[PDB]
C-alpha cells in the first residue's frame, strides 16, 4: 500500500505537469465569443445539454447494482476451497449459480431485459 500511494501521487504530479506545460507551450490567441461557443455542427444550439435526458435502460441499471453484490460472494470461492467442507462448499456454490441463472432466465423470459419500448 504505502509504496503504491507514493507512486500514485508521483504519477499524478507527473501527469499534472504535462498539461501545465501544455497550457504554457500552447499558442495563445484572444478568445472570441464564437470560438468558445459549443460545437453542435455549426448551427446554434436549441437546447442546453442540462435538460433532463430520458432513460430507457433504467431497469437494467438497477439490476446492475444487484448482480455486482453477488460478485462479492462468488469471488471468495477459490480462496476457501482447500479449507472448507467439500459437500457444503460444493452444494452451496451450485445453488448459488443456479439461483443466478434462474433469476436471469426468469427476467429474460418476462422481457424485462429488453429496453423500454
Amino acid at each position: 500500500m504505502f509504496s503504491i500511494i507514493f507512486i500514485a501521487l508521483l504519477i499524478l504530479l507527473i501527469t499534472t505537469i504535462v498539461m501545465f506545460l501544455a497550457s504554457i507551450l500552447s499558442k495563445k490567441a484572444l478568445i472570441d465569443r464564437e470560438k468558445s461557443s459549443p460545437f453542435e455542427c455549426g448551427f446554434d444550439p436549441k437546447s442546453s445539454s442540462r435538460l433532463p435526458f430520458s432513460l430507457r435502460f433504467f431497469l437494467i441499471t438497477i439490476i446492475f447494482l444487484i448482480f455486482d453484490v453477488e460478485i462479492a460472494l462468488i469471488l471468495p470461492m477459490i480462496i476457501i476451497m482447500k479449507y472448507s467442507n467439500i459437500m457444503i462448499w460444493t452444494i452451496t456454490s451450485i445453488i448459488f449459480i443456479l439461483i443466478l441463472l434462474i433469476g436471469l432466465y426468469h427476467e429474460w423470459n418476462q422481457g424485462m431485459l429488453n429496453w423500454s419500448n
Partner: protein
Amino acid sequence: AVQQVRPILSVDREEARKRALNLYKAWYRQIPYIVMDYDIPMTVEQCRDKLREEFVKHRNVTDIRVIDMLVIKGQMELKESVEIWKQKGHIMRYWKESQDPKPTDFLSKFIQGV
C-alpha cells in the same frame, strides 16, 4: 372593376383585422424569448419597437387577400423564430445594421455621386 375570387384565409376585412392582431400578440409575447436565446445586441424595448415600426410599413394595404398573404408570411417567420431555425445573423437582419445611412438631400447625393 370587381371580380369573383377564392378567399385565402379570411372572408371579411374585420376577420383579416382580427388575424393581424393575433400575429402582433404572438410576436409581442415572443420578444423576451428571442433576446435570451439569440446572442444579439438588441434589447426587448428596441425589438418591441421594430415590431411596431414594420407593422406600420404595411399601413395603406387594403386588399384582404394581400393582408392574408402578409399574415401567412408573417406567421411563417414567427414559427421560424419561435424555433431557432433562424440563426443569430438572420434575426439581426431585420435592422440592416451593416448598411450605413444614405443621405436624402439633393446637395449631399449630388456631391456623393449617384
